[PDB]
Amino acid sequence: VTVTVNKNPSHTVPSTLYGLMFEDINHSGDGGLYAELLQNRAFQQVTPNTAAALAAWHPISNAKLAVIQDPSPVSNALPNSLQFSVPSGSSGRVGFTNEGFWGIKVDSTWTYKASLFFRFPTSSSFSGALTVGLQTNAGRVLAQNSTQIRGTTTKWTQINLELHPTASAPDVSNSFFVTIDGAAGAGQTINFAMFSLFPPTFKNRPNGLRADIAETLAEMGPSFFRFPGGNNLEGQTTATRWQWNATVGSLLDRPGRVGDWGYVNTDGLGLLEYLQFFEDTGMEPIMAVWAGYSLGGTSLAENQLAPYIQQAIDQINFVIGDPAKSAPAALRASLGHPEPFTLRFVEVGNEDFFAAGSYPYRWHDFVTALQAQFPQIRFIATTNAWNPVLSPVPQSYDVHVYQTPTWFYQNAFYYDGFQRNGTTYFEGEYAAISTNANDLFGTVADGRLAFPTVQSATGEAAFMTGLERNSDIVFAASYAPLLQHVNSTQWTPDLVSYDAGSVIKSTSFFAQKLFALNKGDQYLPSTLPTNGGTLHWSITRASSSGKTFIKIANAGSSAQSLTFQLTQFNSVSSTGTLQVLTGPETASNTPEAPQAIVPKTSTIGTGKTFTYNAPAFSVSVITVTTN
Ligand SMILES: *[C@@H]1O[C@H](CO)[C@@H](O[C@@H]2O[C@H](CO)[C@@H](O[C@@H]3O[C@H](CO[C@H]4O[C@H](CO)[C@@H](O)[C@H](O)[C@@H]4O)[C@@H](O)[C@H](O)[C@@H]3O)[C@H](O)[C@H]2NC(C)=O)[C@H](O)[C@H]1NC(C)=O
Ligand SMILES: *[C@@H]1O[C@H](CO)[C@@H](O[C@@H]2O[C@H](CO)[C@@H](O)[C@H](O)[C@H]2NC(C)=O)[C@H](O)[C@H]1NC(C)=O
Ligand SMILES: *[C@@H]1O[C@H](CO)[C@@H](O[C@@H]2O[C@H](CO)[C@@H](O)[C@H](O)[C@H]2NC(C)=O)[C@H](O)[C@H]1NC(C)=O
Ligand SMILES: *[C@@H]1O[C@H](CO)[C@@H](O[C@@H]2O[C@H](CO)[C@@H](O)[C@H](O)[C@H]2NC(C)=O)[C@H](O)[C@H]1NC(C)=O
Ligand SMILES: [Cl-]
């Protein structure tokens, strides 16, 4: 195929074209990006006196454990405590462990910060050391530290101890422990609350993020971060929706909530931690607000919305408001960040195409109020575009699609037919999820992808060339989901996977990275690909340097030759860089083979006219300099 590349651009490529979509799914927040190592650290949103309330906690020796509704809890937000009892007639180490999120990486180059609160519910004669530490799951101590406590301590008391392992563990099958001497402790009861164990964090932020994951996200060169959902925004009912103000301030004051993926969220990854991550990485937010619908099916009635609209105003004021003018903005300043954060885009709800009967009045009432308070923000509608008709007219829509790899290359012209009428489009969730057109959301046995494949990433890349061609109206696009804990998964495939110790970069990750890191500010129109075909391309140019990025997706089973014609340019470099992602159709990066499929860089001969053989199932970027 002969591809003519015009010198005169057709439009400016948005700075926001490629970015990330986050919600806490597959333990992407708790157990993932948020660096806390203890699971069920504060007994949030569990039922006292059940086995479920003790999830992740285990006795050492003859310890007796129960989660209680404490008569004198550590805080209003944290009503549950761990009741630890040592039988009379005891000796030797006694206590309890936390298994982490399916393990804990123990590294001799890391300092860990352990903390907990305790009190004796009945004043006692106990006198002895409280030891915290890390052990292998077979019981070998890796690190420990201790402090003296007394049974006369009936008031809540925080212990803060560092841990300094001298040797790394051989694997991640390790636990945090708390012990006393069982002879000293015989017959004693202690109540505990609000445990925490942190490793070193990204940018050394207090209450911050897991560095290997945070660095992997920054490596893809994203421009935006959509958060906090996604389904995790919505709750199952009004009462269990995400609420900004429950996620800020002391961890003692964050109640947590039951999320939308079968597990409790601590809300330790809260609004300020998100915003600080954006500052640390150069991303801008696309922030969602709850919009009167929850996943159990209930829409608030129109005459019930006012307090929820106010809460959305408060949320935005926390991010951008003048501290002198609102309580939320004053709270951001009191938490150490008096300058406003950047916020250009707010999404109204999530997937309101499931509740399109009520979205017209919810959209109308939310956006009327929010646009008046925040004239500069662009509000994003979540129903299917133009059906139903919304008032006020949306300036943006969020479009989601989960489909087969084949659908993606067949639908690369999705935006070409749209009118250009001042509305922009956010492809806020997309992925090729299954090879089974008849059951997309099924099991791996029935075609669901466990991990992205070369097939899936190449189909996505073909669709992405269409997003880039149509970036006069498409302003943003993000794969979903972003993150997966391989030991606790509710959705596959995912962009980036991990266990307690290591990260896996998928084929799709590398397609996202190749697109985002090789993107000019000028879109150069070219000969169109075949609508419905397997071979697609998109060309952009950096206005300041002349670097010219030719992105090619061959989503089919045969190699195809392209002849690029750049004769409209006065000069084209005689060599270019070539970056190629390819492999067997069904190949994936997995925990067992995490680098099976990675990009390869080389040089190729270029000029005013030059050829390139795009392999079957490949994503290629050719970079030349043009003037
Ligand atoms: C700005 O440009 C937009 C993009 O071109 C315009 O969007 C179009 O808006 C009209 C309403 O004004 C929509 O038309 C409705 O279509 C439905 C039926 O639809 C569906 O089936 C067709 C096959 O026929 C399919 O293409 C869709 O995906 C659906 O499966 C009618 O029942 C209504 O009475 C009405 O005709 C278009 O659907 C819509 N196009 C797209 C691509 O979304 C928009 O109106 C413009 N906005 C302004 C303010 O001017
Ligand atoms: C036990 O924990 C304490 C408290 O975290 C550690 O003491 C700190 O050590 C660091 C690094 O040497 C100092 O910067 C702090 O000033 C110390 N704080 C206090 C309150 O003393 C101590 O190193 C830990 N001991 C072991 C064996 O891990
Ligand atoms: C977060 O703020 C919301 C208000 O924006 C609080 O919810 C209100 O709580 C009061 C007292 O229980 C109720 O009478 C109101 O009906 C609630 N309003 C809404 C909109 O839900 C919520 O309690 C705050 N969360 C925390 C942890 O303090
Ligand atoms: C967490 O998931 C990992 C990755 O799947 C598990 O490690 C694998 O375990 C299987 C079954 O024992 C082995 O065949 C693989 O070779 C292991 N893979 C790797 C890369 O080590 C791990 O066991 C899981 N952890 C828990 C606690 O279930
Ligand atoms: Cl397919």
Tell me, yes or no, whether 382 and 242 share the same domain: yes
- Rg of the chain over Cα atoms, rounded to whole angstroms, equals 27
Alpha-carbon distance values, 604 to 381, 562, 612 (Å)? 45, 14, 9
CA atoms within 13 A on the CB side of 392: 16
Nearest atom of ligand 3 to the alpha carbon of 77: 27
At residue 434, what are phi and psi to the nearest 5 degrees?
Answer: -160, 150
Pairing between strand 483-485 and 496-498?
A: parallel
Q: Decide if 433 is inside a domain.
A: no
Q: 427 alpha carbon to ligand 5 midpoint, in Å? A: 20
Pairing between strand 547-554 and 174-181?
A: unpaired
Ligand whose nearest atom lies closest to the CA of 417: 1
Q: 423 alpha carbon to ligand 2 midpoint, in Å? A: 57
Q: Decide if 507 is inside a domain.
A: no
Q: Which residues contact 142 (CB under 8 A, 6 or more apart)?
A: 106, 133, 134, 135, 136, 165, 167, 169, 174
Q: Decide if 441 is inside a domain.
A: no
Contact 543, 520 (CB under 8 A): yes
Nearest atom of ligand 1 to the alpha carbon of 384: 43
DSSP 3-state assignment of 495? Answer: coil
- Measured distance CA(522)–CA(520) in Å, rounded: 6
- Measured distance CA(353)–CA(319) in Å, rounded: 28
The angle at the Cα of 348, spanning 343 to 352, to the nearest 5 degrees, equals 150
DSSP 3-state assignment of 374? Answer: coil
Question: Burial of 501 by CB count in 10 Å (0-12 exposed, 13-18 middle, 19+ buried)?
Answer: middle
Q: Specify the CATH number for the domain of residue 281.
A: 3.20.20.80
Question: Of 354, 371, 394, which residue is a domain's last?
Answer: 394
Tokens of 581: 């992602």
- Measured distance CA(456)–CA(509) in Å, rounded: 11
Short-list 123, 177, 175, CA closest to 149: 123
Pairing between strand 93-98 and 57-60?
A: antiparallel
At residue 22, what are phi and psi to the nearest 5 degrees?
Answer: -120, 135
Task: Give the start-end residues of each E strand in 572-627.
Answer: 575-582, 600-605, 609-614, 618-625
- Measured distance CA(93)–CA(132) in Å, rounded: 12
| Active site annotation includes 585 | no
- Roughly what angle, to the nearest 10 degrees, separates helices 306-320 and 359-373? 40
The verdict on whether omega for the bond into residue 481 sits within 30 degrees of 0, i.e. cis, is: yes
Contact 210, 32 (CB under 8 A): yes
Question: Of 394, 412, 447, which residue is a domain's last?
Answer: 394
- Measured distance CA(346)–CA(369) in Å, rounded: 13
Q: Decide if 8 is inside a domain.
A: yes
Q: Please give the helix or strand (H or E) that residue 370 lies within, else none.
A: helix 359-373
- Roughly what angle, to the nearest 10 degrees, separates helices 271-281 and 211-219? 50
For tokens 């059906």, what's the residue? 387
Question: Of 394, 424, 449, which residue is a domain's last?
Answer: 394
Contact 299, 358 (CB under 8 A): yes
Phi-psi region of 500 (alpha: psi -120 to 50; beta: other; left: phi over 0): alpha
Alpha-carbon distance values, 538 to 232, 485, 535 (Å)? 34, 34, 11
CA atoms within 13 A on the CB side of 597: 29
Q: Please give the helix or strand (H or E) that residue 535 lies within, else none.
A: strand 535-541
Contact 49, 514 (CB under 8 A): no
Tell me, yes or no, whether 127 and 237 share the same domain: no
- Roughly what angle, to the nearest 10 degrees, separates helices 507-517 and 454-469? 30
Q: Specify the CATH number for the domain of residue 121.
A: 2.60.120.260
- Measured distance CA(152)–CA(433) in Å, rounded: 58
Q: Is the distance from the beta carbon of residue 192 to the nearest atom of ligand 3 less than 6 Å?
A: no
- Measured distance CA(445)–CA(144) in Å, rounded: 45
DSSP 3-state assignment of 454? Answer: helix
Tokens of 85: 């009892």
DSSP string, 26-40: TTSTBTTTB----TT
Chain breaks in the chain (C to N over 2.5 A) after: none
Contact 18, 222 (CB under 8 A): yes
Tell me, yes or no, whether 70 and 174 share the same domain: yes
Contact 191, 118 (CB under 8 A): yes
Contact 1, 498 (CB under 8 A): no
For tokens 């929820």, what's the residue? 308
Short-list 190, 163, 217, CA closest to 37: 163
Q: Decide if 284 is inside a domain.
A: yes
Q: 352 alpha carbon to ligand 5 midpoint, in Å? A: 28
Q: Decide if 480 is inside a domain.
A: no
Pairing between strand 224-227 and 20-21?
A: parallel
Contact 512, 220 (CB under 8 A): yes
Nearest atom of ligand 1 to the alpha carbon of 422: 1
- Measured distance CA(154)–CA(618) in Å, rounded: 66
Nearest atom of ligand 3 to the alpha carbon of 246: 27
Domain that holds residue 274: 224-394
Phi-psi region of 164 (alpha: psi -120 to 50; beta: other; left: phi over 0): beta
Ligand whose nearest atom lies closest to the CA of 448: 5
Tell me, yes or no, whether 66 and 134 share the same domain: yes
Contact 7, 568 (CB under 8 A): yes
Tell me, yes or no, whether 240 and 142 share the same domain: no
Q: Decide if 215 is inside a domain.
A: no
Instruction: Identify residue 199 by its one-letter amino acid code.
Output: P
What letter would DSSP give residue 245?
A: G
Resolution of the structure in the document, Å:
1.3
DSSP 3-state assignment of 589? Answer: coil
Ligand whose nearest atom lies closest to the CA of 447: 5
Short-list 548, 524, 531, 552, CA closest to 619: 552
Tell me, yes or no, whether 62 and 7 share the same domain: no
- Measured distance CA(350)–CA(428) in Å, rounded: 10
Tell me, yes or no, whether 177 and 305 share the same domain: no
DSSP string, 56-111: TEEEETT-EEEEEE-SS-SSSS--EEEEEE--SS--SEEEEEE-BTTB----TT--
DSSP 3-state assignment of 217? Answer: helix
Q: Is the distance from the beta carbon of residue 243 to the nearest atom of ligand 3 less than 6 Å?
A: yes
Tokens of 188: 């004693």
Tell me, yes or no, whether 164 and 246 share the same domain: no
Tokens of 72: 């004198």
Tell me, yes or no, whether 233 and 346 share the same domain: yes
Tokens of 460: 């996505």
Q: Could you say which of 99, 234, 284, 351 is catalytic?
A: 351
Alpha helices in 506-572 (DSSP H): 507-517
Alpha-carbon distance values, 427 to 85, 232, 315 (Å)? 54, 18, 24
Contact 254, 246 (CB under 8 A): yes
Short-list 518, 407, 512, 500, CA closest to 452: 512
Q: How was this structure determined?
A: X-ray
Short-list 176, 134, 128, CA closest to 151: 128
Secondary structure (H, E, C), 215-268: HHHHHCCCCEEEECCCHHHHCCCHHHCCCHHHHCCCHHHCCCEECCCCCEECCC
Tell me, yes or no, whether 175 and 287 share the same domain: no
- Measured distance CA(90)–CA(100) in Å, rounded: 27
- Measured distance CA(455)–CA(399) in Å, rounded: 23
DSSP 3-state assignment of 499? Answer: coil
Alpha helices in 154-254 (DSSP H): 211-219, 231-234
What letter would DSSP give residue 114?
A: E
Tell me, yes or no, whether 562 and 614 share the same domain: yes
Tell me, yes or no, whether 97 and 6 share the same domain: no
Q: Specify the CATH number for the domain of residue 545.
A: 2.60.40.1180
Distance from CA of residue 69 to its chain's centroid?
32
Q: 161 alpha carbon to ligand 2 midpoint, in Å? A: 7
Q: Decide if 208 is inside a domain.
A: no
- Measured distance CA(625)–CA(546) in Å, rounded: 5
The verdict on whether omega for the bond into residue 200 sits within 30 degrees of 0, i.e. cis, is: no
DSSP 3-state assignment of 434? Answer: strand
Q: 405 alpha carbon to ligand 5 midpoint, in Å? A: 4
Pocket of ligand 1 (CB under 6 A): 385-387, 393, 418-419, 421, 423
Pocket of ligand 2 (CB under 6 A): 145, 160-164
Domain count, the chain: 3
Instruction: Please name every residue paired with 497 in a beta bridge, in sequence order, or none if there are none.
Output: 484, 504
